[PDB]
Design a binder for this molecule. Structure first.
Ligand SMILES: [Br-]
Length: 321
């Protein structure tokens, strides 16, 4: 029985924790995962203070090569806009990218702004103030959210840009996906971006969004998967799944990555990390699905397996898989 430690992205923490719990019950192995943020996840793996780092933002090929890291995706999730609007239920409100950006730009301050009124004709919107909530530190969720906004709102693109950390025009800072959930839940009129599972598990209302194709879509596990149907994984694991074309493609979709060293100095640890993730691909789909994360296609996992055999070695060049 091995004792493993990972750290990083809170975006997939619900499924990683679930997989960890089950894995221990079936095999005795213990995986301790700390949701500290994708930025931290990266610093820790590079500082070798954990067996594996987790980040939603991918490292470029050059950056991976420079640090001697290997990156592989695990699941597909989606970022949603949790809202606390009195007298509105979950799924009722529809926003489009431009409008979501203007709210984040602080240009739209009330829940009944003409712009929101127009996207929701049958709606009885309150003249309530918009309480914008965003992430306090370096965040992979912030990375995919800002990547999406830069694509749909020119002013956001030019003035704030994309990043795990950006100069937010407005908004209160929340720590972790859980911190944003908690804030929205306590602030009437709040809007905060969270990975879908955090909204569902906390019974937060969320909005629908309009797809790149121009249609209103609901955030569901299938819709996160739809957004990725067009990705050419054979080309690279570092797929941008935001604002993708296609039917029922959730526009703020993203995979998430696990980072491990190519040259394993504690090969036993490395072997066990690989076995845990291999077990998760082989047997963890239902648990990811129960938590509304979509599984990667089998062809992608096979690619990941082949790359493990090719890239992960002990200091004597011996593969660990
Ligand atoms: Br944070």
């Amino acid at each position: 029985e091995a004792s493993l430690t990972g750290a990083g992205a809170t975006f997939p923490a619900p499924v990683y924790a679930k997989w960890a719990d089950t894995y221990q019950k079936e095999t005795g192995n213990k995986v301790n995962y700390q949701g500290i943020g994708s930025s931290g996840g990266v610093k820790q793996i590079i500082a070798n203070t954990v067996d594996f780092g987790a980040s939603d933002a991918p490292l470029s090929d050059e950056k991976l090569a420079q640090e001697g890291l290997f990156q592989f995706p695990t699941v597909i999730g989606g970022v949603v806009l949790a809202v606390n609007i009195p007298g509105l239920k979950s799924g009722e409100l529809v926003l489009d990218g431009k409008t979501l950006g203007d709210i984040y730009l602080g240009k739209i301050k009330k829940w009944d702004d003409e712009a929101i009124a127009k996207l929701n004709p049958g709606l009885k919107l309150p003249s309530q103030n918009i309480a914008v909530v965003r992430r306090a530190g370096g965040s992979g969720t912030s990375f995919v959210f800002t990547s999406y906004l830069a694509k749909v709102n020119e002013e956001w693109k030019n003035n704030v840009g994309t990043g795990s950390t950006v100069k937010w025009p407005i908004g209160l800072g929340g720590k972790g996906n859980d911190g944003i959930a908690a804030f929205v839940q306590r602030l009437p009129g709040a809007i905060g971006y969270v990975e879908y599972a955090y909204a569902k598990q906390n019974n937060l209302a969320y909005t629908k969004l309009i797809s790149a194709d121009g249609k209103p879509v609901s955030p569901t596990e299938e819709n996160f998967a739809n957004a990725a149907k067009g990705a050419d994984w054979s080309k690279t694991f570092a797929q941008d799944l935001t604002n993708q074309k296609g039917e029922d493609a959730w526009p703020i979709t993203s995979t998430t990555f696990i980072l491990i060293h190519k040259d394993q100095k504690k090969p036993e640890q490395g072997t066990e990390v690989l076995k845990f993730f291999d077990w998760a691909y082989k047997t963890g789909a239902k648990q990811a699905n129960d938590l509304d994360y979509a599984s990667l296609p089998d062809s992608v996992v096979e690619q990941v397996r082949a790359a493990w055999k090719t890239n992960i070695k002990d200091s004597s060049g011996k593969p660990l898989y």
